[PDB]
């Protein structure tokens, strides 16, 4: 019965094409669906579309780039600003675009904390060469990291016209 009452009120909602969620009669229930306009289905764990620790380690392993300079802390924050305002990342609303930036500086400080212990990056040459593979973040990866975190964020939006309340009635009822 509680499945029946729920879906007999919530069935005629769909996220319209200007991201608003309206009733059948045109009246607005939500201005964006759920604040960010994001699918709960495509949503990653913790109610966040990315879980950035997993994507960055995925990018480092799918694209390890040997013979690359991998310099950091002085270039990483500089490459992540040159890429992020580059003809793109306008449709990313700047609540997500802050969240990349606070994660990138969060992994920018992790680099300098290791290079604090040893291994100066004077030009990227110390005598034990292995030390530059401690936290390798080389700028072929960090630009592929952004082009993935953009497109994973853009894909996991609420597709317009998606019977939004009819998803809600199942997900409360089941």
């Amino acid at each position: 019965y509680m499945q029946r009452r729920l879906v007999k009120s919530l069935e005629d909602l769909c996220s319209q094409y200007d991201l608003t969620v309206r009733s059948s009669t045109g009246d607005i229930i939500q201005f964006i669906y759920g604040g960010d306009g994001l699918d709960p289905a495509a949503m990653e764990g913790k109610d966040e579309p990315l879980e950035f620790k997993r994507v960055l380690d995925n990018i480092k392993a799918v694209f390890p780039c040997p013979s690359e300079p991998a310099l950091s802390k002085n270039e990483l924050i500089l490459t992540t600003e040159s890429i992020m305002k580059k003809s793109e990342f306008l449709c990313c609303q700047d609540s997500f675009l802050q969240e990349i930036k606070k994660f990138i500086k969060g992994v920018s400080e992790k680099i300098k904390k290791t290079r604090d212990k040893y291994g100066i990056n004077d030009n990227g040459t110390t005598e034990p060469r292995v030390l530059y593979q401690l936290d390798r973040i080389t700028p072929t990866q960090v630009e592929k990291f952004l082009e993935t975190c953009r497109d994973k964020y853009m894909r996991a939006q609420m597709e317009p016209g998606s019977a939004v309340g009819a998803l809600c009635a199942q997900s409360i009822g089941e």
């Binding site: 879906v7 998606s162 019977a163 009819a166 998803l167």
Partner: peptide, 12 residues
């Protein structure tokens, strides 16, 4: 049934 109607609604 009408319960499977909502499943066909929720798929869009």
């Amino acid at each position: 049934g009408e319960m499977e109607r909502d499943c066909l609604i929720g798929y869009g």
